[PDB]
Design a protein around this nucleic acid. Structure first.
Ligand SMILES: Nc1ncnc2c1ncn2[C@H]1C[C@H](O)[C@@H](COP(=O)(O)OP(=O)(O)OP(=O)(O)O)O1
Ligand SMILES: [Mg+2]
Ligand SMILES: [Mg+2]
Lengths: 555, 414
DNA sequence: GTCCCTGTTCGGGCGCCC
DNA sequence: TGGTGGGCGCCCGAACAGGGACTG
């Protein structure tokens, strides 16, 4: 049937008119599917024939559905979508199995031809004009328009989603303690009622649904764990993901890769310790989806590592509100992290990976703080509260960091976990200048025009060096000078620089960098026993800034 | 019916389209309960996805209350709303408010639901309630009455507030009452307790009109400014003088009177950092001039309402925070401190947001205008948590900055 | 003004769901 | 065999947005 619900008023964007686009050629197979679909739809008044009043047209095609038997009638409304008013979308995100709590009885329902059971705005119908070509000798052929939502229009999903929420609203009011996870037309329904009373209630629901024009065929999961839902199989006490199959190409290409990472990321919600850094790296400069790319030895290795970890049998559990959310995080390499979320120790609710790199320069304690951050927002979506953490980081390392860092930062309630690799600060700047350590006055200068530079130092003990650099920048020369003083000093040293830029980087205590130069510096800072870095305004005659500035200005 | 008042957006500007951010079960439960009620009273109506607009919502748990407060972050919409601010408001700012013994902040936001809101504007005040684990799509609403948090609301309701208050002000001319957004600021030079009795008296008026009527006990006269300050020392090292000269060179952009030359002279040569340098009597005196030049208050700084206040904050450590408020750089209008529990469990984020609520509150009291904050924190950290600590009915614009480790060393306290 | 360097946003491809 | 839509996720690269430092 067609839902007796009222339509959602839509407009074209101002000054714009509906599409005039020629039907492209369809397979024969597909045309037969189309008229089969179109004449039954037309009989039910979901589409109705139009004539030469309708100047418009937009191309239409079909593809097989998940059951591969049935055909889906689509429409390429790319042109019309482009000219349709905006919507505020209302699907805010994607329900997760780990968010379900245990229910005594469970049903999964799907709706017949969902979109096609929801009416389209009368005034807009005209722009949805299409035309089913037939066998070129028997028919022109037939030209229809939608009186219901088309599968391909920008406005359909949001309007269906709104209307379903509208439609279910009354049932939910009557039944505030039956839970209906509503994803487009896919309903998860759970209760704490015995099987046969639940089943009664399911029948009230289908009839409520049917009274609003929504048919529920079978297609209806029943006394039937495991339930197939939203990409998973839900068993009474455990859920799992439907098996993931990674490709097995032997000449991966950008698209092969982009889809390899795709699957792994999908996978990481339940498989611990998935990593995609080295793989993701390959994706870098390449300019075409097709651009075939050779694996790096480490991406090669990474992939092998993920392959073996998927070979393992894993499940998840359902959520128990009367119990803590716990999140434990392990450090991987290369700014990569894994977490696992649970309430009982070796029964994961779900897992995940944070690997994103924010910043040219950073260290492990910042990243760990970003992993915590992300995991918090995710928990708040899925469970609507915050987890207690288990971080591989000493209370001391944190307290040090939080005191040393000029920015506000905070990690919610947590506890240390002896699980290496532990997260540390890889070196410490002194707060006071070091007694009995050679004082280095460093500086750089670069000719903006020619890109030629000098970097060097004068020390208080009488030594002075200048390095000429080529193809550099002011900042680089100043980072270069700081690098030279580290190279040419003992385990303990004092460095004076006139460079906020460079002073701000090194102060932030990075252990990683995109900059090969800042890396080399980080290495030296780790080797040293005491470093102290003080700043001074430049070109103010504050020797021996006076002095080393004089040495590096032959530009 | 009370007549509807035509309200526009600024020319060239389209209503807000900001995505709702995730809320806690706690919060959604509240929002949903509050909202169905507002809907029952006709204040807001369900809307669909063809309204293109959106503005985030959440809730706060005011004081130790069992009552939740809906808060609709409206600063986008407000930015884009036509100036009643200027074109449709005639409010002088009560300069005498900044000087009252005690000032209490009442939430009169509730009185706004009495006025209907221009039919044609409604679609701009749209907002969406989220669901846990996305069990459903978002549930969308829009206002029919004047929204709390919309800058249009005080302007539109101005007239009627003046009627309602007129009698109370007449009898208490020594009491100054100032409105800002959802907030009524009420100041007395009464001794606490009689002041407090005056506040419950004002609430008795604001009840005889309905319907009905937190953040208690400001004292605009217990506030004070934080100077830049210079260390006192018996022996000074190269490093001391190097830090001294650096601090002043910068402080001189604020006080152009500051001089450094003579102290720099001591830093001739290329000396070890820890070597002690005796202060030649002149430089020993130059440190006396500057030490005083810092006392004479910053010259030539005039408030311009047609510019935003800027607020820079610095984490000073051990619970310490410093702020400055300016409109042009180095032209501070006020500059202060904000200390806190140096305990074991100091929550940097909670303090940051208690810092911005205080600094805002002052700015409103002094200029009737919200400052834009430059926050020394990461965007994500801040957004993950700040509403867990919000207690104000208003929300200031802000932007996040990674402050140079230098700028902190200047305002630092001895 | 000019160069740098750094941060943000946005959009594109892929994944998953309907 | 392709050729559609909306949501969320992840990556990556573009456009900006600033600050800071330069020139004579
Ligand atoms: N590839 C797609 N393109 C556009 N819309 C889609 C697509 N896949 C699913 N949808 C939307 C349109 C459908 O009405 C709605 C329900 O999906 P689905 O249940 O699998 O098919 P259906 O409900 O339309 O017919 P049925 O399920 O009875 O075979 O999801
Ligand atoms: Mg269906
Ligand atoms: Mg320099």
């Amino acid at each position: 049937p067609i839902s007796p619900i009222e339509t959602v008023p839509v407009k074209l964007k101002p000054g714009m008119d509906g599409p005039k686009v020629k039907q492209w050629p369809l397979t024969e197979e597909k045309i037969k599917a189309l008229v089969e679909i179109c004449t039954e739809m037309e009989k039910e008044g979901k589409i109705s024939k139009i004539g030469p009043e309708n100047p418009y047209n937009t191309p239409v095609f079909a593809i097989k559905k998940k059951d591969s038997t049935k055909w889906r009638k689509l429409v390429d409304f790319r042109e019309l979508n482009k000219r349709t008013q905006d919507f505020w979308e209302v699907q805010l995100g994607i329900p997760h199995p780990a968010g379900l709590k245990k229910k005594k009885s469970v049903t999964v329902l799907d709706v017949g031809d969902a979109y096609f059971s929801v009416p389209l705005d009368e005034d807009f119908r005209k722009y949805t004009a299409f035309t089913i070509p037939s066998i070129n000798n028997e028919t022109p052929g037939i030209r229809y328009q939608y009186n219901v939502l088309p599968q391909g229009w920008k406005g359909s999903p949001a309007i269906f989603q709104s209307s379903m929420t509208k439609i279910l609203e009354p049932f939910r009011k009557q039944n505030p303690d039956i839970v209906i996870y509503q994803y487009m037309d896919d309903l998860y329904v759970g209760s704490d009622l015995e099987i046969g009373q639940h089943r009664t209630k399911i029948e009230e629901l289908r009839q409520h649904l049917l009274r609003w024009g929504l048919t529920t065929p079978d297609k209806k999961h029943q006394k039937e764990p495991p339930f197939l839902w939203m990409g998973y199989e839900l068993h009474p006490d455990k859920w799992t993901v439907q098996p993931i199959v990674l490709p097995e190409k032997d000449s991966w290409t950008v698209n092969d890769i982009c889809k390899l990472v795709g699957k792994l990321n999908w996978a990481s919600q339940i498989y611990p310790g998935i990593k995609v850094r080295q793989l993701s790296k390959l994706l870098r400069g390449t300019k075409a989806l097709t651009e075939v790319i050779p694996l790096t030895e480490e991406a090669e290795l990474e992939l092998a590592e993920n392959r073996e970890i998927l070979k393992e049998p894993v499940h998840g559990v359902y959520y128990d509100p009367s119990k803590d959310l716990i999140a434990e995080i392990q450090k991987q390499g290369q700014g990569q992290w894994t977490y696992q979320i649970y309430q009982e120790p070796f029964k994961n609710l779900k897992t995940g990976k944070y690997a994103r790199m924010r910043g040219a320069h950073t260290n492990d304690v910042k990243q760990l703080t970003e992993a915590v951050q992300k995991i918090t927002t995710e928990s708040i979506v899925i469970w609507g509260k915050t987890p207690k953490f288990k971080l591989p980081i000493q209370k001391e390392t944190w307290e040090t960091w939080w005191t040393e860092y000029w920015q506000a930062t905070w990690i919610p309630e947590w506890e240390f976990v002896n699980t290496p690799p532990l997260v540390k600060l890889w070196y410490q700047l002194e707060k006071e200048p070091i007694v009995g350590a050679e004082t280095f006055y460093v500086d750089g200068a670069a000719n903006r025009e020619t890109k030629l530079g000098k970097a060097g130092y004068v020390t208080n003990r009488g030594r002075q060096k200048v390095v000429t650099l080529t193809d550099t920048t002011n900042q680089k020369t100043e980072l270069q000078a700081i690098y030279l003083a580290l190279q040419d000093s003992g385990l303990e040293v004092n460095i004076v620089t006139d460079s906020q830029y460079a002073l701000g980087i090194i102060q932030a205590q990075p252990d990683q960098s995109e900059s090969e130069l800042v890396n080399q510096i980080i290495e030296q800072l780790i080797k040293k026993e005491k470093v102290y870095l003080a700043w001074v305004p430049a070109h103010k005659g504050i020797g021996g800034n006076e002095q080393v500035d004089k040495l590096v200005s032959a530009g | 019916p009370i007549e509807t008042v035509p309200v526009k957006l600024k020319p060239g500007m389209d209503g807000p389209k900001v995505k709702q951010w995730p809320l806690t079960e706690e919060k959604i439960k509240a929002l949903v309960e509050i909202c169905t009620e507002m809907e029952k009273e006709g204040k807001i109506s369900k809307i669909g996805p063809e309204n293109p607009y959106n503005t985030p919502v959440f809730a706060i748990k005011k004081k130790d209350s069992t009552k939740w407060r809906k808060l609709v972050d409206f600063r986008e919409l407000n930015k884009r709303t036509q100036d009643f601010w200027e074109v449709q408001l005639g409010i002088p700012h009560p300069a005498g408010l900044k000087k009252k013994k005690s000032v209490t902040v009442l939430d009169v936001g509730d009185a706004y639901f009495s006025v209907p809101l221009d039919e044609d504007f409604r679609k701009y005040t749209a907002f969406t309630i989220p669901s846990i684990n996305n069990e459903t799509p978002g549930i969308r609403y829009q206002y029919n009455v004047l929204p709390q948090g919309w800058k249009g609301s005080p302007a539109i309701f101005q007239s009627s507030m003046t009627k309602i208050l007129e009698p109370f002000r007449k009898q208490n001319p020594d009491i100054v009452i100032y409105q800002y957004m959802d907030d009524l600021y009420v100041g007395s030079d009464l001794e606490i307790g009689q002041h407090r009795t005056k506040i419950e008296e004002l609430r008795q008026h604001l009840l005889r009109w309905g319907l009905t009527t937190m953040g208690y006990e400001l004292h605009p006269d217990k506030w004070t400014v934080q100077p830049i300050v210079l260390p006192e020392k018996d022996s000074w090292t190269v490093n001391d003088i190097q830090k001294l000269v650096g601090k002043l060179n910068w402080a001189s952009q604020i006080y152009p009177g500051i001089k450094v030359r003579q102290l720099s002279k001591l830093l001739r040569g290329t000396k070890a950092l820890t070597e002690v340098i005796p202060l030649t009597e002149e430089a020993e005196l130059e440190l006396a001039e500057n030490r005083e030049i810092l006392k004479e208050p910053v010259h030539g700084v005039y408030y311009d309402p047609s510019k935003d206040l800027i607020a820079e904050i610095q984490k000073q450590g051990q619970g310490q925070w410093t702020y400055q408020i300016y409109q042009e750089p180095f032209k501070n209008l006020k500059t202060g401190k904000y200390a806190r529990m140096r305990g074991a469990h100091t929550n940097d984020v909670k303090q940051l947001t208690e810092a911005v609520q205080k600094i805002t509150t002052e700015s409103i009291v002094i200029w009737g205008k919200t400052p834009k904050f430059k926050l020394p924190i990461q965007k994500e950290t801040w957004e993950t948590w700040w509403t867990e600590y919000w207690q104000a009915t208003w929300i200031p614009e802000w932007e996040f900055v990674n402050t140079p480790p230098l700028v902190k060393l200047w305002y630092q306290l001895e």
